[model samples]
Target: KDTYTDRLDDWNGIIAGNQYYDSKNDQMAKLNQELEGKVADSLSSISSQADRIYLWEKFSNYKTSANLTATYRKLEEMAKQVTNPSSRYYQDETVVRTVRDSMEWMHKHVYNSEKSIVGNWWDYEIGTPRAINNTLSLMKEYFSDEEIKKYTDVIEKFVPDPEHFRKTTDNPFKALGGNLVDMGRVKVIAGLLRKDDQEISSTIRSIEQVFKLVDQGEGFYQDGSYIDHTNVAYTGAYGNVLIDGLSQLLPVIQKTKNPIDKDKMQTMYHWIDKSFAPLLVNGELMDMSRGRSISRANSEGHVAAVEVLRGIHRIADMSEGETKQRLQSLVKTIVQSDSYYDVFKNLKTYKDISLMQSLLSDAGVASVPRTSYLSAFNKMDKTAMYNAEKGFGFGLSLFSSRTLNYEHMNKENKRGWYTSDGMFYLYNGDLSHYSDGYWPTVNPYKMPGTTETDAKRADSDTGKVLPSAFVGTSKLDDANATATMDFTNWNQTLTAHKSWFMLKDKIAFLGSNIQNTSTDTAATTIDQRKLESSNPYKVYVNDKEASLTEQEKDYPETQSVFLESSDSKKNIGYFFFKKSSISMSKALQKGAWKDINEGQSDKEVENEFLTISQAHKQNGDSYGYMLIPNVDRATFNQMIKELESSLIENNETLQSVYDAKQGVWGIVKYDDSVSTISNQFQVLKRGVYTIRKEGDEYKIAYYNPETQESAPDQEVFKKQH
Candidate 1:
């Protein structure tokens, strides 16, 4: 690290290794070098009269020792060229407007730190501190003694003093993650540039207090998960800030009067492995449970991963090879063939690119694996389950009265209705299958695996919470699980009991006691399929090939007995096992609200979906269906044929399923009558529950739909052999 520089262009970036960036094999050196060259070239290539002054004025931020000579040369040349007032490129009102306006704004607003800006607080608060600190460090060398005071005095207000900043937010994630780090990183920089102990030590203490929970309790989960905004798993959005903030803050502070301890720094490094690193699936962040952020691109997470990984790259005690591997994986994944040049100019992406090119050249290329696993965030906050497998994956979001469906109110996601309505998202290996292109345009009411009435959601329904409290999941065994959801209709006196059984080859869905007191109520289960799927679709019923009748062919769409994908490779099938009649339609579905997400949509941004609805309009209604993935047409039909004998979906009196093959019993007991269960096992209250027999032990779990209280102990008969 260098002392206060004698030149305006000289400035320190990341000054240490093992503490932060590896100075020997620096990730940002290439980009910083490229950026230096770009600035020099840009300054010299300036054309027109006003353009020259505009580039000259903004050139203060781009100060560098390498471009010092060239910048002055261009500035001198401009003065002579605009000397003639009669010339076409005259130094009139326009030429001075750009240069004179910049200096005027700087004197009025930039130098006066006390002058509060009304607009975006982030730009005024965090952005101002960062710009002033770094700017004064470089510019202090060139400007006169009197001129430098103009900035240094104002830079004091932007420093890390207790007066301007405080730990106000009870939310530790935001407190340390962004607030302290975003505003504090540069505060430390300002302290170091001015050599003030109070500025550096005060900010460092606040951040260290919050960092204590970086990898332990509430802020960061032990399993490498993060909780932000109360219940949401904010590993992608807010979590990234915590990581990148650490990357920038630690190195600078490590060299200060109050250096971060070796033990604490080690824990920060371990957080990358334990918390941030595990979420990525082949470099794609597993962030579906991240509230409204799920609609955005997961690739954006690569930037933060790269930043965090760089800090831990050379830590002696840590696993450097694994760290480098993660860095390489994220770099290669984000910099794909299509998006290579797209982010070529981004400073962060370039850092990863430079390091990636070095890593690939030295170690040779290695294939990144697509990690298939299931994450069940049962407690802490937002309740949801994620399954990312090889050929296909699934996502299920369940909501209780305490949990929100989806976020709205000036946000783009109008998907609250789909949150608890048994919404199921299945993707067929392809990356584009779950891209944002389909999110806003897809029908929110007809989302696959959702049971909804014809009632349309008005603006008042935005952010509406689900009423039922029996929304949860239970894992029966390694390869078996079930999700139980119960809800009342919107503005109608209708309620339904629903359960999803996850098995080996297929997912069996069951619903029972679906009674509606309102005569106008008509419940419909929709399969919102991708309309223009490359694969051809065919249906068969009762061992015979069946075609959709003309009556079923309506717009905005319909479906099957056993629908199977034509392409053998893209094996996905749907079996409408328990529906009286099915209908299909093809139509455009506009976003319910103004979508302001990354891949946003407008009136023209609609999608065509082959919507299949199973309409049940009676008081006592029940239905069942099976979603089979990674199975061919023959296998799909085979499962459909064996579904009756093998997987007994008995909804005769109450919803019950006995998977004879898996030896798993899923029953929703409506009442405690022997005739009700048909004397299946023994005594039990009328509750939705599941029973799985594994060898000598029988695991039975009951759900209290009425309340969160535990069910009363029941008497059951068992043969003592």
Candidate 2:
């Protein structure tokens, strides 16, 4: 039986106490000191000219609405310092008056309904309203009802509906993904500030839109894929924002009279296990799902993962029983695995820090082991394989008619033209393998696992959606999987049929019908990785060491190549069924972050790379190679001699392999033409299939890549003697 006033106070307490600065903790002492400095600098920098209080130089320009919103954001920060009990300026009358006066002056001059709107619509609707709501909630006692109404009215004008955009021309165009969550927050907080129960209830109801699973477009899909901006896989970036916003809003609304039902809350909890857990490796979120955020210098794998951790912490606080226990265990695991970054210092809120500190200090709560799993995000055309026991991960990025090859938006990911062209990621014990200047310096055209030409792209930020739909993955078991891609180059001048067979110990890559009409020669790159002292450019060709001293070397009679990293104890073996010419190089590459992201620093950096590739001849060229990870030289040599796995058929119609030791067969059929292999098996239709011998019977799994559907699991087919 809580009144509206009671709910408002409770909401403010959550925001002002748990979400703000803490004075008692010694760790926050530096942050407190920094806030004091910022308050002083802002007060001195404020200026009053021609009846307007300008907090920054661009306040007069209406085109830069972000600047206007930034001024209010600064005022909000100053207000937090004045109201926070732990802050040195807590309840300081002079500082409080300045903040309140600035807020009033901005509403009167810059941000009212009468003012002309400009710049991005997001600033006015979501950004400014969010900051203003926080400020009003903090300093509500200082202002009267009449003064508060003026600010609330401005917010309502810009954001009339929580679900739909106010400025867009599309009739009833609803906000989706992160944008919907943000607007919901703005609307709910405004309701609390005005003590409008109906507004709060309706806004909370609209937020339920984001919780439901989507089939085709933006939001979480059935197969653990999160899409944003229509076609980009954004589980790591926009998905983080969505979860974080809901984490903050859900708890507050649960205290109100109108709360989300138990079923909807369960959906929110399910997201942590399905959409996020599979993508998290050790303490990193895979970059394949991060979209354009990968180009930003600050938003690397581990950094993006930290935001997700905070969100999960908030959700865990509201949960109970096994659900709560599992989430707490997950947080502990991520915090413990993070050796390079301090999780405590990076956390933003006091509640997150305190809860994490308690979780880590507790002895009874044990960390869960990283289990091995393979996930095929078919809807998004991506796959992730993690060998937790061996401490390695493999990710494959693909594209089809349903998904974009890569997203190059807002001047980010400029050189990501080939990011989704069957590019594979290999992450080992070296946590910084991809983060250490790899994106800016790696040769984009020669991305590992992609077959492409040397012809320069007309625009680095531009890419095309692949016209074919035979692009997806199918999992046989927890460890074994397969993926297929019918790839057509961006210019439509080249095409190839590519497939990957992932086994327990190694992965077999096969490419068929590689035809190029462009004059430039096309090649399939085996790998291109950054070289360092620990991961030097040491290679052994045909069981003999070769020199790679800043020069490219061609091995015409190459049967096998092995790369070993001494410090990390990671070894990779590549075996070619047919002796082929392999080109290897170790050269220094230089680039700047600004080359990809305009907002990043322009300082030039250098890193050496080790590249291995196979040049294709004219048309109808094909290649096959096996990648054996976590192997030693002796084991590699023995395996090469044993040759347990052999290519049964590699042509335009079908590509199949048989592992005699395991009694397993992997096949990818592109056309309807019937094909048979080993005189014992027959392929009747076009699909990706796997058959394994078990006792006196065979267990088969079939999936249609074009339709993106799978048959029943392990259909038994009697053995024919």
Candidate 3:
């Protein structure tokens, strides 16, 4: 039997320096500096009020859970210095006394059963208790048996059961996914503090709930989708918390006789590749799956990727053989690719920093090669990642009745009304494309790959679900994929059939059957990007360089338009199949973070943007264009001249593209009535199909968007003699 001492030793080892975290001089020095600063700040800001011992003005409201949790977090940081011998204040009587006094005061006045709970329940049940538990464990020897009991009693009172939410008549929220795992973490520590083996064992068993895959809601799906809050694609936000919490819990559990189930670990390992891998583009987590977190200035894609990487590193330490090597390689790859932030310096925990340092030094572990692939997260109603080696990556966000158009909650992601309406995210060598105030400054309605009208929304969070079920992607191979969205605008005043054919180096976009009932002008956005330098990047029309100003300019009779970035020389080529007037603009757009997120900065920030859009007529207006990324003028011209991809059909019932060079045909059959495609191929049902000819044989792949299933590849249809 594992004794209380054994568990305590295990936890103490983890907190201090264990096999996983050999706290080296550099990491310890960094921790000491952070601890000293936080301790100084806490001491100066310490409140004199009896009700609030460590009240900071930002968290002055006692009813708000952040007030109580923030105090606990500060105490925990101070307690770390007292526990670690390398710290300057280690075992200092002054610091230990202060930490002890503050902790007891917090329990007595604020977080006790006698006090009425208010504000977010997460703070009380998970956040505050989690911080409190860590503090108590670090300063365990300082408090007597009676004082420890009082603290443990407070934790028990708030968190009666780790598996379920604190039962209330109004509280409908259950401990699911990340929430469940967090509660389990708190309970395990609580169990350790109180020396209750049953509590620890039961909590560990309950954590298994998170490891199981779910088909409907709040967990990982087999299709590499992770949905949280029922409908949001949250693999990057909540998924981070889930994986990190499990990583913390597993190390301790394995120390005891009761290790996590092998099957559950396998599911977790599967998530690294399935749920997490595809969403990452060169070390940054794509914002599409990050939900409302995208609005927060502190929570960019690369920042979220760091948290996920920390979890991956921990899991790698626990794993063995190929699993260990692969996890290590993934960590190395992201760490190497991340240019925005030094991942090593940003790692929160000492264990993670030390582990990453060792991994980076190990030359034997090879970095995983960036390969070409495409993924359709069918469950989340999102299609992602057509990554080509030495080429750019593209991700598309779409929503149906099954998924939300966009998540706008707690005043975050307020301008995310159109993020899920066939928004295209292009990733290349420029790592900071989505970062640097892109969300706040970019015109939300005219986001790339979306067809929008001038119809205005008065309030934020007006995103709505599409009524139609035909929204998904179909893949033929690594280089060939297609996505279709039968879009009906939020107010139902506008409707369109949109399709994207991704063929290796270039992506062909086709919009058909566009109709608008409202008086507002409708347009399809080809691309919208933030300018890298002060001077506007050069733009060319029909092989002639066009001068740009702050005002929007119309370039009529446009055959092709090319944009070359002054900073990176990275370019995007645009070719319109049918001659259409293109709207081009390079102007400064101003916005504040507080406009989108309440907690963020209210100060105005400005950035210049290059927007290229195609205007549409009132009804039955169709548009076709090709977007070629990272192409130079020479290559762009050559590719345009050699372009053999024909828009075979673009109509209300069906849309198809045939790439003669690639010998591939991509089709989106909107209804069963549309049987034949250009009188060449037959479509039995409404589905996304990819047909390619290899040698004399024709290979076909089909995905039914309505049913959300990929059917078996059909038998080859030979070419005519």
Q: What is the lDDT of residue 471 in candidate 3?
A: 89
lDDT of 3 by residue, 1-721 (tens): 2465566656655554423433455764675577678777876777756665346776667776767888788888877777776666788897888887777677767788766568777788788888877877777878765676678777787777767776532564667888888987788888887877788888888887887898897899998899888787889899999988788778788766566778767898889888888888778888998988999988887888887888888899989999899899988977786666677555766666678888988999887666777887888877776555555778888898888888887667888888888888888767887888888888877999899897776545455667998888888887888889889998888899999888777788889999999889999888888877753467889888998778889988988998866533368888887677888888888998888888789989788888898888769998888888887787788887777447778889888877878888888888766356555556566788888877767677788888877664432222221
Candidate 3 residue-wise lDDT at 294: 93
lDDT of 2 by residue, 425-544 (tens): 887766777777878888888999999999987444465678998887767776777788999998888889999887766778899999999898899998997777656745899989
Q: Candidate 2: what lDDT?
A: 0.79
User: Top TM-score: which candidate number?
Assistant: 3
For every model shown, the clashing-pair count is 9, 0, 0
- How high a TM-score does candidate 2 get? 0.93
Two-way TM-score contest, 1 vs 3, winner: 3
Candidates' lDDT values, in order?
0.50, 0.79, 0.79
Q: TM-score ranking from best to worst?
A: 3, 2, 1
